[PDB]
Amino acid sequence: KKAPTVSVIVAAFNQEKYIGRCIRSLLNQNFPKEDYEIIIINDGSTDKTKYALEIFGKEIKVIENESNKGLSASLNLGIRSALGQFIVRVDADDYVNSDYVSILHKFLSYNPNFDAVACDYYLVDDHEDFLSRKNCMIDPIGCGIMFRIEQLIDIGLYDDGFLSHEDKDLRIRFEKKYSIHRVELPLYRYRRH
């Protein structure tokens, strides 16, 4: 097989309500199938999440924890298993536009000087109505940032407890040496809860 260049990570604990829309949007990318992979961690769900993942068969890669290990352990498992050099986390209750992966990857591929990229997003409700558009630098979120794997490793990604810390604190650690470049397109969809 050809190694994918982009690995998408989704940590999922009891996400039966939204995980279907999430995965469908990731499978509906205009990026070539051979160039990315979708890695879902079922972190000990007790609802229909396991069945939801079975729906999609071999189109996704599933890591199943027998019991709930938590976000940091789950993200560690998913990223360690990832084959791509670009890594992005998508929340299980979020979803993305069909050009999301291709455009973020294009900006990284053509601009080695850009360490990581994120794009703007819409706040959406449970019926996928766009409530408002957010600038990702004014209102940063913890998901949807495409990173270069070795830069994450450089700042201590795999250290015990690192990925359990608050999003704002992880961002500070990344921005000590690196910078996130904003792509001025609203291609991510962030669920209001």
Side-chain angles (χ1 to χ4, degrees), residues 55-57 59-65 67-120:
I55 290 294
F56 297 96
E59 296 200 63
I60 60 176
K61 299 196 173 93
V62 174
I63 297 164
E64 182 173 329
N65 297 326
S67 49
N68 177 259
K69 292 169 172 170
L71 177 61
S72 184
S74 296
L75 294 175
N76 268 271
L77 288 169
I79 297 169
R80 287 278 195 189
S81 77
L83 300 173
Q85 297 74 53
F86 300 106
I87 312 292
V88 57
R89 177 186 165 198
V90 175
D91 256 0
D93 54 340
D94 298 341
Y95 68 97
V96 292
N97 174 260
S98 59
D99 293 319
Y100 171 78
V101 175
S102 171
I103 293 181
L104 294 204
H105 168 269
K106 199 170 298 284
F107 271 94
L108 286 175
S109 181
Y110 276 113
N111 301 285
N113 42 312
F114 296 171
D115 298 319
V117 294
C119 65
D120 289 348

Side-chain angles (χ1 to χ4, degrees), residues 11-20 45 47 49 92-93 193:
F13 178 55
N14 290 343
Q15 299 283 354
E16 72 179 4
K17 184 173 185 177
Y18 297 117
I19 188 87
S45 299
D47 64 359
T49 296
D93 54 340
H193 273 149

